[PDB]
Amino acid sequence: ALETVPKDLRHLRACLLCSLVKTIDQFEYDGCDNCDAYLQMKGNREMVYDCTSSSFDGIIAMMSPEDSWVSKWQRVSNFKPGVYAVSVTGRLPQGIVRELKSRGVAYKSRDTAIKT
Amino acid sequence: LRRNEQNGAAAHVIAEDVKLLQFHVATMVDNELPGLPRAMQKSGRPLK
Amino acid sequence: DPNLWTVKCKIGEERATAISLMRKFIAYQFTDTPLQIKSVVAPEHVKGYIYVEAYKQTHVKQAIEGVGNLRLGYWNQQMVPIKEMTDVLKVVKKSWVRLKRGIYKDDIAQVDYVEPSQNTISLKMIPRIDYDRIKAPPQRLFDAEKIRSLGGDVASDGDFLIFEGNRYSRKFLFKSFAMSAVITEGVKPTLSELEKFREHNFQPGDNVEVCEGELINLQGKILSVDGNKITIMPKHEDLKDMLEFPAQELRKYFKMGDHVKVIAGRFEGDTGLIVRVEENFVILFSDLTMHELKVLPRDLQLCSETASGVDVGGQHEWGELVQLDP
DNA sequence: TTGAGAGCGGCCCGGAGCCAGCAGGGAGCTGGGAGC
DNA sequence: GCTCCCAGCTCCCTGCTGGCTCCGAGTGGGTTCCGCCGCTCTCAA
DSSP, X not given: OTTTSOOOSSSEEEESSSOBEEEHHXXXXXXXXXXXXXXXXXXXXXXXXXXXXXXXXXXXXXOOGGGOHHHHHHTOTTSOSSOXXXXXXXXXXXXXXXXXXXHTOOOOOOOOSXXX | OHHIIIIXXXXXXXXXXXXXXXXXXXXXXXXXXXXXXXXXXTTOOOOO | OOEEEEEEOOTTOHHHHHHHHHHHHHHHSSSSSOOOOOEEEOOTTOOSEEEEEESOHHHHHXXXXXXXXXXXXXXXXXXXXXXXXXXXXXXXOOOEEEBSSSTTBTOEEEEEEEOTTSSEEEEEEOOOOOOSSSOOOOOOOOOHHHHHHHOSSEEEETTEEEETTTEEEEOOEEEEEESTTBOOSSOOOOHHHHHHOOOOOOOTTOEEEEOSSTTOXXXXXXXXXXXXXXXXXXXXXXXXXXXXXXXXXXXXXXXXSOEEEEOSSTTTTOEXXXXXXXXXXXXXXXXXXXXEEEEOGGGEEOOSSOOOXXXXXXXXXXXXXXOSOO
């Protein structure tokens, strides 16, 4: 919805798990809107910097994951409507990855770009 | 075009600009061609 | 699946047009005239037009009948080839810098100090100024005395000086410039720039020897050339087979008594006959000028055209009458 | 500090071949049944 | 009842009509014309 819709083009940075592209303002006010329960994106900034990537190539204004071959490719047919990045450059800390694995959420890298 | 084929490899901009280059060389051959519009300079005189 | 249609947008404003059209879709999705298109693609390296994901050109027209950036493409639209969806979304990938804007565009600058704030960095430039003499510009050394004599906007602090809009110089303009206003990657200044502040070039027809490996002491003519690993097809003596060699394994070896050309350097553009080929030093007598020139094997090259005997500028040729003074 | 200017930087018929579309014999192909 | 002269078919091919390039007689002399727009910094108020 409009809450997930970014408001300005300043300080855009994409998440590492759902590749959610939103500004630091709404990351501070709400954090993530996809795996907030699994990540605790809200209430901090140091861990937000580690759990979000400032380098993303290409974005998609997907709204219908259930009937999108875009969503099929980028494995967000199960996530909500929103703005997602085709390529995300970064990786979670080993501690957070281990925590997610223990909770049962394997971390799949969103870096779909072809490195040479 | 050389740069685009070297790195971008768009294959759509590539084709479009290839067609434009063919048009430019055809213009160099003859400015007069029934099937396409004629070239011109900022002074408006059709090129020779 | 929906098909892609190419719609022309103003050059350099495709991102703005996409933002505006998605905003209008947000504003009019709940209205009686929602946008039936699915998405829009504006590739970073594609300027002039964008792609709209829709099933019908009618839907494309109804979507693009908004901002005037797409008026030119409003008249007609063009299908994107079926095989082209895969190509649509593909993305291909004390130092020295160069300024982007201002009169110092495309000029080498030496990074003197780097500010931790990541906002501006101190750079050493060669002033391209007329010293407030013509304006009411080739690179030249700063003249603090000259600018002081000319007066105007100038502040003297010994070797340090401020002039013409807070332009700072010391002994060489020393001014802070924005991080995004300069390029810190892919500058590679030349030796002249270093004084102010590898490479492989093989061509067909030249003879190169193998200086290492089991195929050492084999001289073959150059047939093909590549970037780094040539995998050359040498025409080795008493060997009809075409072997394979990289650029590093081969050396520009030339047989005694043959015409050679200087590819680059102080002796660039000269031709002559070698006198004695040492391990690295090749001494040759230039043909037009009976001058002894010592050059590296990499700096030599063979051609059938001799020296013209004219200056590079085409104003004076060798052995001519000039005016040393009136 | 801001506003504009100055200069750099980039963007009226002719004829005649000539093709392409269509139209009518025409022998191959295989049924058709006439004949043995 | 299967070849075979025949009939019908079926391609088959040579034989008729329409859009189209491209040219178009011999020297003075006069007037006009060769970007425009964007864009970023200097000096002035």
